[PDB]
Amino acid sequence: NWGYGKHNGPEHWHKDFPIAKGERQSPVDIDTHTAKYDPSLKPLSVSYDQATSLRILNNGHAFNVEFDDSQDKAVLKGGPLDGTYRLIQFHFHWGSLDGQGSEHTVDKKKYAAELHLVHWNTKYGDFGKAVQQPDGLAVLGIFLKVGSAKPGLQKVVDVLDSIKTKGKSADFTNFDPRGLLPESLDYWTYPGSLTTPPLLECVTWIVLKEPISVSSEQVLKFRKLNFNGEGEPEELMVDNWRPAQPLKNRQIKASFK
Ligand SMILES: [Co+2]
């Protein structure tokens, strides 16, 4: 029964999910002066040329663009990762106002939104087994700032009216996630968790330094979605972000000098 409201939001999650107060929780503030360049990081490889998107779903908390992960078709490798991680879905977190919405922050700066491309480690066979492992998942996080429109986002925006309410889905084939990436792949990395319940501590986070720009009109259309189901009182889908959590005994590494 978790969500993002006053009575069921992030400050309540620990009661059903005690790992919310764990040693490896996400998101975090990225203190750029404390993060250290790591020359042992290999080059990051984002191989999304054969990505096969299938469907888009409003799950009552965000919307997921789902991919066919039955074959190695869209994969993340390199950087801090060992082996191959397969893309299963992406989603966003965003605010009610342009001054908030991201989960990670950079020297306490909040962006308008944050894109998460979720991948699972193929050594574990499927996503469900991967989320029982400390290196099960790799999430590529990309900040969104408001400015010029992002052409590669428009197909997402324009289908949101068809998935307004919780539980609705639509066909969403032939979507190219390359068009959501910034120019540079410079990143920060650290060990963390899912940022929604069950908050499992299974993620290698790779957070790109360069944000993408999206237009005010694009993000306003995200804010017309609903957390509620059809025929229920409208609750706008906004502020579906968890705030930064304690870094504890962790180090954030940078890929760039
Ligand atoms: Co997320």
Q: Which residue has the tokens 């590494």?
A: 253
Q: How far apart are CA 30 and CA 141, in angstroms?
A: 12
Q: How many CB atoms lie within 10 A of CB 232?
A: 11
Between CA 135 and CA 47 the distance in angstroms is: 20
Distance separating alpha carbons of residues 148 and 143, to the nearest angstrom: 14
For 202, the enclosing helix (H) or strand (E) is: none
Q: And the tokens for 243?
A: 């705030």
In a domain? residue 70: yes
Q: Which residue of the set 7, 61, 104, 119 is catalytic?
A: 61
Residue 207, Cβ density class (10 Å: 0-12 exposed, 13-18 middle, ≥19 buried): buried
Rounded to the nearest angstrom, the distance between the alpha carbon of 111 and the centre of ligand 1 is: 14
C-alpha 90/C-alpha 117 separation (Å) is 4
Catalytic, 12? Answer: no
CA 58 / ligand 1 centre spacing (Å): 14
Question: How many angstroms separate the CA atoms of 103 and 216, rounded?
Answer: 19
Q: Is residue 64 part of a domain?
A: yes
- For 153, the token pair is 């986002």
Is 193:19 a contact under the CB 8 Å cutoff?
yes
Residues 6+ apart with CB under 8 A from 146: 98, 112, 213, 214, 215, 216, 219
Nearest to 243 by CA among 188, 195, 192, 194: 195
Q: Is residue 156 within 8 Å of 65, Cβ to Cβ?
A: yes
Q: Is residue 241 a contact partner of residue 100, using CB atoms and an 8 Å limit?
A: yes
Note whether residue 147 is domain-resident. Answer: yes
Tokens 């289908």 appear where?
A: 159
Elucidation method: X-ray
Integer Cα distance of 193 and 256 in angstroms: 23
Does a structural domain hold residue 3? no
- Residue 83 corresponds to which tokens in the numbers above? 């082996």
The first and second tokens of residue 56, run together, are: 């888009």
Range of the domain at 23: 13-254
Binding site, annotated residues for Zn(2+): 91, 93, 116
Contact 140, 208 (CB under 8 A): yes
Could you give the count of Cα atoms lying within 13 Å of 196 in the half-sphere of its Cβ?
A: 16
Is residue 80 in a domain? yes
Q: For the domain that residue 42 is a member of, what is the CATH number? A: 3.10.200.10
Q: Which residues are annotated as a binding site?
A: 91, 93, 116, 195-196
Show binding-site residues for substrate.
195-196
Domain assignment of residue 220, yes or no: yes
- Tell me, in angstroms, the distance from the centre of ligand 1 to residue 91's CA: 6
Å from CA of 112 to ligand 1 middle: 14
CB proximity list for 231: less than 8 A, separation 6 or greater: none
My answer on whether omega of the bond before 198 falls inside 30° of 0, hence cis, is yes
Nearest to 142 by CA among 86, 89, 186, 98: 186
74, part of any domain: yes
Cα 116 to ligand 1 centroid, rounded to whole Å: 5
| Number of structural domains the chain divides into | 1
Q: Is residue 59 part of a domain?
A: yes
Residues 193, 200: Cα–Cα separation, whole Å: 5
Task: Give 18's DSSP letter.
Answer: G
H-type alpha helices, the chain: 13-16, 127-130, 154-159, 216-222
